[PDB]
C-alpha cells in the first residue's frame, strides 16, 4: 500500500493555488485554481512575455537605447504613487537591458510603460498584444487592461492561468526567462535587489518568477524551481499573511519534489511500434509521437511504468502523412492507465 500511496497535500494558507510540472503539464495539487482574482504585479509576467516574444523575433536588441517619453515619467503621473519605480525621466536614453531588468527584477511600473511604447507604439496596442497571447495560450480566466497592472479595475487572472503564463515564459522565451534569477541590477547608481526573495532560499533551486501584493490581492507569488532537469511551477494567489509570503509556496514546491518525479519515456522520431501498411511504397509504418513525452509519476516508480497501444482503425492504408494520428499510446502503472498520448506515423508513406 506504500507503493501506491497517494500523498496528502499540505495545508496552504492562501485562497488559491496550483502546482504543476513544467514538462508534462501535470497538475500535482490545486485549490480554487480557476477563480478570478486581482493579479496585481503578476500582470508584469505577461508584459515580460510580450517583450520577450518581440526580442525573439528580432524586433529590438538588449543594447538598443530607449528614449523615455512623458507617459513613462515616474513623478509625472501620480498613477504611479506608492508603487515600484525606476524614476525614469523624459529624454533619458536607457538600454532595453536595464528597462527589462527594471520590469523583471524590480517590477518597475514606469519601465513597463517605457517598454510598452517602445515595443508596440502605445500602451493600448501593447495590452492588445497581451490579450492576444492570453488567447493564444488558451487561458480561460485572464484579462488585461494595463501594461503594469495598476489602475485596471477590470483585469483578472487565476492561479492556473498564472502558472501557465509562467510555463510559457520558460518555454517560449528562455532568454527573457533567464533574467529572472538575477538577484540585483544597478540603475542611476542605485543598486536594486530582485524582489523575489525565494531566490536566496538555499534549500531549493528557485529561479523565478514574480511576487506581488495588494490589500486588494493579498500575497501573490508565481515560483519555479528545479531539482535536476525536473521543474515545477507553483502559483499561489491571495496568500493570507506576510510571514507565508514565500513559505507557503516553498511547502508546495518541496512537497512536489519529494513525492513526484518526471520521466521522459519517448522522444519524437523514435519508433514505438511498427504495423503493416497496405498500398504503400513501404510494407510497414513506423509509429511514435510528434512531441517528446513527459509524464509525472510517484517518485520511485519509473521502473514500474508500462506502455502499450491501440489502433483507431483495423487496417492502415497508404497514403499515410507524417504525424498522422493512427491510435493512442497507453502508459500504465499498476494495471491502470495513467496517461494517454497520440500515436502517429513517423515517416510519411506515399502510395506505391
Curated annotation (Swiss-Prot):
Domain of life: Bacteria
Location within or outside the cell: Cell inner membrane
Matches recorded under SUPFAM superfamilies: beta-lactamase/transpeptidase-like, Penicillin-binding protein associated domain
Membrane topology: Peripheral membrane protein
GO molecular function: serine-type D-Ala-D-Ala carboxypeptidase activity
Catalytic residues (positions): 41 (acyl-ester intermediate), 44 (proton acceptor), 107
Binding sites annotated in the UniProt record for substrate: 210
Annotated metabolic or biological route of this protein: Cell wall biogenesis; peptidoglycan biosynthesis
Pfam families for the chain: PBP5_C, Peptidase_S11
The protein's Enzyme Commission number: 3.4.16.4
InterPro entries linked: Beta-lactam/transpept-like, Peniciliin-bd_prot_C_sf, Peptidase_S11, Peptidase_S11_C, Peptidase_S11_C_sf, Peptidase_S11_N
Keywords (A to Z) from UniProt: Carboxypeptidase, Cell inner membrane, Cell membrane, Cell shape, Cell wall biogenesis/degradation, Hydrolase, Membrane, Peptidoglycan synthesis, Protease, Signal
Gene Ontology terms describing biological process: cell wall organization; peptidoglycan biosynthetic process; proteolysis; regulation of cell shape
GO CC aspect terms: plasma membrane
Catalysis: reaction(s): Preferential cleavage: (Ac)2-L-Lys-D-Ala-|-D-Ala. Also transpeptidation of peptidyl-alanyl moieties that are N-acyl substituents of D-alanine
Described function: Removes C-terminal D-alanyl residues from sugar-peptide cell wall precursors.
NCBIfam families referenced in this protein's UniProt entry, alphabetically: PRK10793.1
Similarity comment: Belongs to the peptidase S11 family.
Listed name of the protein: D-alanyl-D-alanine carboxypeptidase DacA
Organism of provenance: Escherichia coli O157:H7
Upper lineage: Bacteria, Pseudomonadati, Pseudomonadota, Gammaproteobacteria, Enterobacterales
Amino acid at each position: 500500500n506504500i507503493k501506491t500511496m497517494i500523498p496528502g497535500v499540505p495545508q496552504i494558507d492562501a485562497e488559491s493555488y496550483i502546482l504543476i510540472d513544467y514538462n508534462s503539464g501535470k497538475v500535482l495539487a490545486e485549490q480554487n485554481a480557476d477563480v478570478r482574482r486581482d493579479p496585481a504585479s503578476l500582470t508584469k509576467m505577461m508584459t515580460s512575455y510580450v517583450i520577450g516574444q518581440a526580442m525573439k523575433a528580432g524586433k529590438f536588441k538588449e543594447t538598443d537605447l530607449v528614449t523615455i517619453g512623458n507617459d513613462a515619467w515616474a513623478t509625472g503621473n501620480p498613477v504611479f504613487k506608492g508603487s515600484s519605480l525606476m524614476f525614469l525621466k523624459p529624454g533619458m536614453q536607457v538600454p532595453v537591458s536595464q528597462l527589462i531588468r527594471g520590469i523583471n527584477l524590480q517590477s518597475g511600473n514606469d519601465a513597463c510603460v517605457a517598454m510598452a511604447d517602445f515595443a508596440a507604439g502605445s500602451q493600448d496596442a501593447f495590452v492588445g498584444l497581451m490579450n492576444s497571447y492570453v488567447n493564444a495560450l488558451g487561458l480561460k480566466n485572464t484579462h488585461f487592461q494595463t501594461v503594469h497592472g495598476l489602475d485596471a479595475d477590470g483585469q483578472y487572472s487565476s492561479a492556473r492561468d498564472m502558472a501557465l503564463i509562467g510555463q510559457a515564459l520558460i518555454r517560449d522565451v528562455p532568454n527573457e526567462y533567464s533574467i529572472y534569477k538575477e538577484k540585483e541590477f544597478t540603475f542611476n547608481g542605485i543598486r536594486q535587489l530582485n524582489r523575489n526573495g525565494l531566490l536566496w532560499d538555499n534549500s531549493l533551486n528557485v529561479d523565478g518568477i514574480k511576487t506581488g501584493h495588494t490589500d486588494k490581492a493579498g500575497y501573490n507569488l508565481v515560483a519555479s524551481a528545479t531539482e535536476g532537469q525536473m521543474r515545477l511551477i507553483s502559483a499561489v494567489m491571495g496568500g493570507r499573511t506576510f510571514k507565508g509570503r514565500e513559505a507557503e509556496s516553498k511547502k508546495l514546491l518541496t512537497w512536489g519534489f519529494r513525492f513526484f518525479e518526471t520521466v521522459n519515456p519517448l522522444k519524437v522520431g523514435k519508433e514505438f511500434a511498427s504495423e503493416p501498411v497496405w498500398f504503400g511504397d513501404s510494407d510497414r509504418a513506423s509509429l511514435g509521437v510528434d512531441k517528446d513525452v513527459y509524464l509525472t509519476i510517484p517518485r520511485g516508480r519509473m521502473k514500474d511504468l508500462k506502455a502499450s497501444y491501440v489502433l483507431n482503425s483495423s487496417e492502415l492504408h497508404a497514403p499515410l502523412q507524417k504525424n498522422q494520428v493512427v491510435g493512442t499510446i497507453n502508459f500504465q502503472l499498476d494495471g491502470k492507465t495513467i496517461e494517454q498520448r497520440p500515436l502517429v506515423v513517423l515517416q510519411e508513406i506515399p502510395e506505391g
